[PDB]
Amino acid sequence: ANFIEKITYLGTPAIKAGNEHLEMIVVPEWGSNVISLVDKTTNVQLLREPETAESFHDTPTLYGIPILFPPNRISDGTFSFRGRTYHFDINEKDKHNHLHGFLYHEKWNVVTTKQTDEGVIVETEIDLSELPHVQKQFPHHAVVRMTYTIKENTLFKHATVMNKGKEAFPWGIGYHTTFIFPAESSLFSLTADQQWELDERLLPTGKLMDVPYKEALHEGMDLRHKQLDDVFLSSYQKRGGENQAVIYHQHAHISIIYKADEQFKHWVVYNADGKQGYLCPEPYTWVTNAVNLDLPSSLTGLQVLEPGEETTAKSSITIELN
Numbered sequence: 001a002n003f004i005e006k007i008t009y010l011g012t013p014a015i016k017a018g019n020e021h022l023e024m025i026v027v028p029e030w031g032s033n034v035i036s037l038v039d040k041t042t043n044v045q046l047l048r049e050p051e052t053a054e055s056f057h058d059t060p061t062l063y064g065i066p067i068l069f070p071p072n073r074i075s076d077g078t079f080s081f082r083g084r085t086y087h088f089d090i091n092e093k094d095k096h097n098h099l100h101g102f103l104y105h106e107k108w109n110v111v112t113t114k115q116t117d118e119g120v121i122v123e124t125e126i127d128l129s130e131l132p133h134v135q136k137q138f139p140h141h142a143v144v145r146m147t148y149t150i151k152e153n154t155l156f157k158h159a160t161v162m163n164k165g166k167e168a169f170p171w172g173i174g175y176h177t178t179f180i181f182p183a184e185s186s187l188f189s190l191t192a193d194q195q196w197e198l199d200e201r202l203l204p205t206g207k208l209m210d211v212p213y214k215e216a217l218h219e220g221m222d223l224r225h226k227q228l229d230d231v232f233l234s235s236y237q238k239r240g241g242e243n244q245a246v247i248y249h250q251h252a253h254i255s256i257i258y259k260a261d262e263q264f265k266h267w268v269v270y271n272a273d274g275k276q277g278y279l280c281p282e283p284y285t286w287v288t289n290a291v292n293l294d295l296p297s298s299l300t301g302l303q304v305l306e307p308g309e310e311t312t313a314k315s316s317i318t319i320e321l322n
């Protein structure tokens with residue numbers, strides 16, 4: 001059995017949806033952020049939720065499931081594609097970067113909902129051609145549609161990117177998914193063997209380096225004393241197997257299995273100073289500053305949409321009790 005229910009979340013219109021296992025709340029006006037995800041059998045909130053509307057707007061990439069299109073940093077807000085130069089807003093002033101794209105602070109539209117014995121679906125969408133300031137930076141008719149499905153114990157979260165315009169464009173997407181993570185008693189694992197060497201502006205040098213603690217990382221490890229803001233390379237490209245981050249909550253015995261498809265070639269892991277009680281395992285289809293790297297696309301994960309084409313990038317959050 002499943003349900004949809006319109007609600008007000010901190011004074012903004014929102015949609016609660018779920019079944020007997022899981023319940024989400026998506027907030028279309030807040031960059032289509034999935035702001036709440038609850039495990040119903042244990043009654044546990046999984047995501048970092050904002051105390052107030054104002055605290056959300058202070059840091060809208062540090063709550064729920066923010067959408068990063070494109071993800072992370074572009075040096076000087078500048079890059080070229082097929083001969084043409086682009087200038088995105090420099091919103092990270094100290095490191096002189098564009099950071100986190102166009103969509104996490106814009107209003108999306110609810111395009112449909114669908115309920116069957118296969119689960120409950122909510123779809124949201126935004127058309128960048130309708131955003132005049134975005135068009136100044138990125139004059140392309142990109143349309144992004146999110147399809148959220150809750151079925152059994154999994155939230156499926158699919159992004160479909162469409163080129164409805166006259167020219168090709170490069171694209172990447174990531175999520176800044178912020179889980180509650182008590183440092184003392186939760187464990188984290190990730191399918192990664194290598195990570196990208198970063199400079200003081202958090203920009204890749206182009207070099208990869210082995211993750212020294214990769215065995216611990218694969219198995220599940222605590223993050224006490226470890227401060228992360230790291231760009232990991234998914235091990236899937238080179239080794240196969242899985243592409244996923246796992247969080248294990250030791251008290252209620254809840255496993256959160258965050259899977260992503262082969263397009264999600266990189267994971268950024270961020271836990272601030274380690275004392276903020278959250279963790280962001282962020283799957284990205286492209287590496288930070290991918291647009292400015294002369295490296296093969298099999299590595300960077302850069303993608304291009306020709307006019308009239310579309311691509312769906314899949315990921316999912318499964319909650320297991322063990």
Ligand SMILES: OC[C@H]1O[C@H](O[C@H]2O[C@H](CO)[C@@H](O)[C@H](O)[C@H]2O)[C@H](O)[C@@H](O)[C@@H]1O
Pocket residue numbers: 074075076077078079203204205206289292293
């Ligand atoms: O932003 C345009 C420049 O992009 C590249 O350089 C930046 O990105 C590199 C890779 O992350 C950094 O090492 C470098 O420090 C950044 O300045 C490109 O190599 C430059 O030619 C472009 O002007």
